[PDB]
């Protein structure tokens, strides 16, 4: 039951392990415009340069070069940037897979699967990112308080109105409770 | 005892830095037909014999080639970093293997396993010995002790493939 | 005391403070020009055919970007190689340093200090470290005898440094 959403997670991590990364993951380069050929090869430009192709193209070269060296510098910057992001999402995907696996193990030991569906419905209510936080920090910080979190949704939002680290402190203390 | 000291010496030599070449990832560069073929009969035919459509065609082709080639080799570099940190993890794991294996080797209360390990080195390459002491070093000492006792089983395991030979080594550890 | 600043400069290297000498510039071959080919003479080579000319344009841009990135990758590989190499030979220089020392204070000479100053003035720390690298067991002793023979030392310093090391080995065998 609850392991099905773990399988959805397995598909998002499959998008990473297979290399079939999401389109939004990839980042396009930001480049200065290519110099305009017709800005100089216009017949009006030819009259400017006495109907000579060679002289129009000297300016054309100036314009074009710098653009291509900037292109290669931006390509190096882009390989660095996008490789960094792909790596980081790789570690995030891993941490998610083992964290979710352990969390669903704990929920299975909790042996109340019919509560896990409403639990996760509450998570896609407004804590998707908070669910990711649960996964990354420690997936099972409060077992019976997870039931209560299902139970406490409003005062759940009350608790979530306050920031992440202090919320971690509150979750640790309520774990000391449950 | 000295085999330990050389093992770590080599291995913190590994940690403070050096890298082999295996981690390199070949970038992916997608080929593509050129604008000469695009103004050719086939290219113009697929663009309905329009030169301006071919102009848009090669401009889009360059832009998308930038897009996809960039994504390809940047993912290749990301995987290169992945395998580099994997190499770091393997180095740390082999450190643990060396330390615990040559710490537990003396717990047998006997020194005669040294020549048995030397016989294992002769029969079986030291790289495979490092691998096996990495996998499970708790019975490794008795493992090459008995292997030096019976080199015939060492040869018969060397004949067979590495993974199934490892499985049989695990069985030999078990029925001890 | 020279040993102490030997180590401080050694780990000064070890914090990545590599000299500019280790910065190796990758070679970028000249960029192809669109204007060598879409101009009057280039299209004359191309018989005024813009299709082939702009095809050469595209191919040149693609291959130039590819060779630029290849040069970058080669620069990365070689810079890593040189960095690791120089770290290693730094390790052997500091080796020669402290084995030279511990051997020297193992020996029971009365007048170590001033002769050590004189030769460290005469030979750079790297040169001395290489001296111990080639001859480690009694580099101190070759320094002692050279102080007992700095004249030749002079002839020596006058003559080739590598050949100076050759003559140092010669006299070390001679004693």
Numbering used by the authors:
A (entry chain C): 68 to 245
B (entry chain B): 70 to 245
C (entry chain A): 71 to 245
Sentences from the paper on this structure:
Tailed double-stranded DNA (dsDNA) bacteriophages and their eukaryotic counterparts, such as herpesviruses, possess a dodecameric portal at a unique vertex of the capsid; this portal serves as a channel for DNA packaging during viral assembly and delivery. The portal interacts with multiple copies of a scaffolding protein (SP) to form a nucleation complex, which initiates the assembly of the major capsid protein (i.e., coat protein) and other minor proteins into a procapsid. The P22 procapsid consists of an icosahedral coat comprising 415 coat protein (gene product [gp] 5) subunits, a dodecameric ring comprising portal protein (gp1) subunits located at a unique capsid vertex, and an internal core comprising approximately 250–300 SP (gp8) subunits and 3 ejection proteins. In this study, we present the structure of the SP gp8 in complex with the dodecameric portal in the P22 procapsid at subnanometer resolution.
Three column-like structures, each interacting with two neighboring nodules, were observed on the GOF nodules. The nine nodules, which were essentially identical, were formed by α-helices, and each column was formed by a three-helix bundle. On each GOF, each column connecting two neighboring nodules consisted of a three-helix bundle. The three α-helices were contributed by the column domains of the inner base-associated gp8, the outer base-associated gp8 from the neighboring nodule, and the side nodule-associated gp8. These three SP subunits interacted through the three-helix bundle, forming an SP trimer. The gp8 subunits interacted with the neighboring portal subunits. Each trimer interacts with two neighboring portal subunits.
